[PDB]
Amino acid sequence: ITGTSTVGVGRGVLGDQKNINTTYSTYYYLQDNTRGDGIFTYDAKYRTTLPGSLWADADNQFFASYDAPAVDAHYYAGVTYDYYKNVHNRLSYDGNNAAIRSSVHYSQGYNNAFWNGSEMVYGDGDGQTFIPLSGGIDVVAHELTHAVTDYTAGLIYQNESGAINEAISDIFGTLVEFYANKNPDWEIGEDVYTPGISGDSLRSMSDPAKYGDPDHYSKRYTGTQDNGGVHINSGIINKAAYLISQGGTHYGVSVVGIGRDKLGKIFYRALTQYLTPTSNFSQLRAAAVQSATDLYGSTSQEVASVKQAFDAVGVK
Ligand SMILES: CC(C)C[C@H](NC(=O)[C@H](CC(C)C)NP(=O)(O)CNC(=O)OCc1ccccc1)C(=O)O
Ligand SMILES: [Ca+2]
Ligand SMILES: [Ca+2]
Numbered sequence: 503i504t505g506t507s508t509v510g511v512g513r514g515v516l517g518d519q520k521n522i523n524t525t526y527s528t529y530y531y532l533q534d535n536t537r538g539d540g541i542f543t544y545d546a547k548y549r550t551t552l553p554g555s556l557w558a559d560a561d562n563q564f565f566a567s568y569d570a571p572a573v574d575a576h577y578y579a580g581v582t583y584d585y586y587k588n589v590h591n592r593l594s595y596d597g598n599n600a601a602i603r604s605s606v607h608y609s610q611g612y613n614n615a616f617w618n619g620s621e622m623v624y625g626d627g628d629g630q631t632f633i634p635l636s637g638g639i640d641v642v643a644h645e646l647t648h649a650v651t652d653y654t655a656g657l658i659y660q661n662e663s664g665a666i667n668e669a670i671s672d673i674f675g676t677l678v679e680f681y682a683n684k685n686p687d688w689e690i691g692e693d694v695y696t697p698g699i700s701g702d703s704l705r706s707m708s709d710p711a712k713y714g715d716p717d718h719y720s721k722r723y724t725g726t727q728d729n730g731g732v733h734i735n736s737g738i739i740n741k742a743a744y745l746i747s748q749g750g751t752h753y754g755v756s757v758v759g760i761g762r763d764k765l766g767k768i769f770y771r772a773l774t775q776y777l778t779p780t781s782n783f784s785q786l787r788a789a790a791v792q793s794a795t796d797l798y799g800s801t802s803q804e805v806a807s808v809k810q811a812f813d814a815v816g817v818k
């Protein structure tokens with residue numbers, strides 16, 4: 503859409519008011535011209551045909567219930583773009599300011615969100631297991647991060663490399679949640695999962711076992727479902743990442759925490775410089791150790807904490 507940049511206001515999934523970047527040309531569109539080559543939000547209209555229609559509104563006010571998921575997918579994708587640029591100096595997912603596209607209201611009662619190889623897609627949930635998925639900033643950043651991985655390490659979505667792929671998305675989705683300071687935690691999907699149950703979440707990084715996911719390599723899923731447990735074995739890496747940042751004693755192994763910022767720095771560098779499509783857990787350990795060495799020196803505390811964390815979850 504060619505037109506004039508403006509700013510509209512709307513209400514998100516959780517009922518919060520926010521300003522969003524729009525474009526005016528007869529109608530007001532969900533097109534943000536301020537970030538890279540743009541952020542574009544589409545209406546999939548309860549269908550599965552993608553991307554749908556670029557989102558058009560007559561008055562630049564998005565307070566209708568149908569508007570909510572579009573407001574949050576659009577705003578959160580801008581925050582995520584900002585985190586990557588400001589913290590890691592990366593311009594969009596491809597590092598060259600590629601336009602970011604998202605489609606909301608996909609299918610009917612769809613309990614998921616995904617990156618399709620080219621855009622982000624968000625279900626509205628069935629109203630019980632989930633509310634519209636774009637209302638969770640960690641969900642939005644998890645999605646966008648699948649694009650970053652695809653453009654960098656290219657981790658195949660199955661078995662060990664696939665669980666690394668999932669852990670990266672959970673790790674950066676949590677870092678983005680802390681960055682925006684939106685009631686941050688080490689849990690995934692809490693803001694959009696089981697609207698009737700308080701206190702739960704989809705996965706836990708602090709204690710993956712809480713929901714039945716492994717927190718040690720010896721408890722790894724060896725089966726075939728979920729692409730060989732990509733959403734299951736990611737718990738082993740999630741736990742390692744939480745220990746590096748926060749510290750703690752796990753299975754008798756003590757880790758001194760080095761904080762989130764450094765965790766982000768070491769993970770980003772492993773991702774963009776050392777990981778490959780087929781990397782396994784043991785290769786990730788080597789990658790993280792080498793990144794920390796590059797950044798802080800072989801004899802630093804940072805390197806020491808990375809080794810301890812991996813030894814705690816039984817990776818190597
Ligand atoms: C019950 C669901 C939410 C759990 C799980 N999905 C998830 O954990 C998150 C959403 C979550 C952060 C809210 N979605 P995802 O990005 O991991 C699903 N992606 C996904 O399955 O991607 C594979 C794919 C490749 C190419 C084209 C299309 C799809 C799953 O698919 O098993
Ligand atoms: Ca309107
Ligand atoms: Ca939170």
Ligand SMILES: [Ca+2]
Binds near residue numbers: 640686687690691692
């Ligand atoms: Ca969270």
Ligand SMILES: [Ca+2]
Binds near residue numbers: 695699701702703
């Ligand atoms: Ca809940």
Ligand SMILES: [Zn+2]
Binds near residue numbers: 644668671
């Ligand atoms: Zn994922």
